[PDB]
């Protein structure tokens, strides 16, 4: 049998064909491969955009226009790439939520580099949104890069060193395009290490109980379910591309960047609004920035906060409710982030901001200790 002994097809076999997998993993386990597909789509649409895009402020806005009007089928490539990025962040957030609800974070190595995979995608989509060089691109790029000015002593030096000047200008757009090109390949490399550590143990499953007593081969059972899921992923993408391309995009980005005046109200893309809300919830520069970093780096210390003698929340009602109060709370912070710093959105943004950190750090750890005592162990 050559499938099991060829040094190249051996690694494919042990990952997609004869890999033992649990027999009961639900649709929430489909998002791992949809992330891979999303990445592949962003490579290909991204690559075919880079063959017609130019990286300088004078014609960066116009080269994207040139794609949507003049090159054959470039407008569809461009909206696939724009909406593909948003589908990427849908899958990312389901992927993480699956890991929290069902306790998959106990795979420390897999989980802790998963956090790294989250940061690098954010850094990618950030440096992608700058490239069309619209108004939102420019000033969104200005707010973000100035976060480093809050670091004491060395702040301004790192910002102007990143900028290559005294503000985001021609030098930034060129290097950001270079970074946006190369990072998605680094991502693919780390995603391969994601799987390598994963296969060390195999998948968790909805129950949190070892599935060694009842495994099925990945092929044909999860190859076909991953196809079906991908076909629903294409459906989601194409509905956005072909019936609502500017639903998630802001209108202000359709006016060339102006370094002299801002829009009266700026809002990130939806997938960053929850974190922008946390930033604005503090009337301090360095405080807001640190609260923004810990908002995402909180994931790295979830495994240290596991108190339950059970792994999944499937059998933990009191943790379920606190889990869904976090989704609603995160859905609240997303709403505030899309609204102007005005009454009562300000005070709401602070209460939802505490509730975020309060749930993860206090309410959920102690909630697991209670239900352990309710079960007499």
């Amino acid at each position: 049998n050559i499938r099991k002994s060829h040094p190249l097809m051996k690694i494919v076999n042990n990952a997609f064909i004869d890999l033992p997998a649990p027999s009961n993993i639900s649709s929430w386990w489909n998002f791992g491969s949809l992330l891979g597909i999303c990445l592949i789509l962003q490579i290909l649409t991204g690559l075919f955009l880079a063959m017609h895009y130019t990286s300088d402020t004078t014609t960066a806005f116009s080269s994207v226009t040139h794609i949507c009007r003049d090159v054959n089928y470039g407008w569809i490539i461009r909206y696939m790439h724009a909406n593909g990025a948003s589908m990427f962040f849908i899958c990312l957030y389901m992927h993480v939520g699956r890991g929290l609800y069902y306790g998959s974070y106990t795979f420390l190595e897999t989980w802790n580099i998963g956090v790294i995979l989250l940061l690098t995608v954010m850094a990618t989509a950030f440096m992608g949104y700058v490239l069309p060089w619209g108004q939102m691109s420019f000033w969104g790029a200005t707010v973000i890069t100035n976060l480093l000015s809050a670091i004491p002593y060395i702040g301004t030096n790192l910002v102007e060193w990143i900028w290559g000047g005294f503000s985001v200008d021609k030098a930034t757009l060129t290097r950001f395009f270079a970074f946006h090109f190369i990072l998605p390949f680094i991502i693919m490399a780390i995603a391969m290490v994601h799987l390598l550590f994963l296969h060390e143990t195999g998948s968790n499953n909805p129950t949190g109980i070892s599935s060694d007593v009842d495994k099925i081969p990945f092929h044909p059972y999860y190859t076909i379910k991953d196809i079906l899921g991908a076909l629903l992923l294409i459906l989601a993408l194409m509905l956005l591309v072909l019936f609502a391309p500017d639903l998630l995009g802001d209108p202000d980005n359709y006016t060339p960047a102006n370094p002299l005046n801002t829009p009266p109200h700026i809002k990130p893309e939806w997938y960053f609004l929850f974190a922008y809300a946390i930033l604005r919830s503090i009337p301090n520069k360095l405080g807001g920035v640190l609260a923004l970093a810990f908002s995402i780096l909180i994931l790295a210390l979830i495994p240290l906060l596991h108190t339950s003698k059970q792994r999944s929340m499937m059998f933990r009602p009191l943790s379920q409710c606190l889990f869904w109060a976090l989704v609603a709370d995160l859905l609240t912070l997303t709403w505030i982030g899309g609204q102007p710093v005005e009454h009562p959105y300000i005070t709401i943004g602070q209460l939802a901001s505490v509730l975020y950190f309060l749930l993860i750090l206090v309410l959920m750890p102690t909630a697991g200790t209670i239900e352990n005592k309710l079960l007499k162990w």
């Binding site: 102007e160 900028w163 503000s167 002299l260």
Partner: protein, 49 residues
């Protein structure tokens, strides 16, 4: 060697010679009455007078 290597590479990202050469600005002052703020262009960033 590794220092000079890394030093010359990070310095490449710093602003080039043509970015530090942006000249200064003259402003005709009789343009502006009392109680008004007019904005000008200097080093790419606004200049409020």
């Amino acid at each position: 060697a590794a220092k000079n290597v890394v030093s010359q590479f990070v310095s490449s990202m710093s602003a080039s010679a043509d970015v530090l050469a942006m000249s200064k600005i003259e402003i005709k002052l009789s343009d502006i009455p009392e109680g008004k703020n007019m904005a000008f262009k200097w080093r790419g960033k606004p200049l409020f007078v």
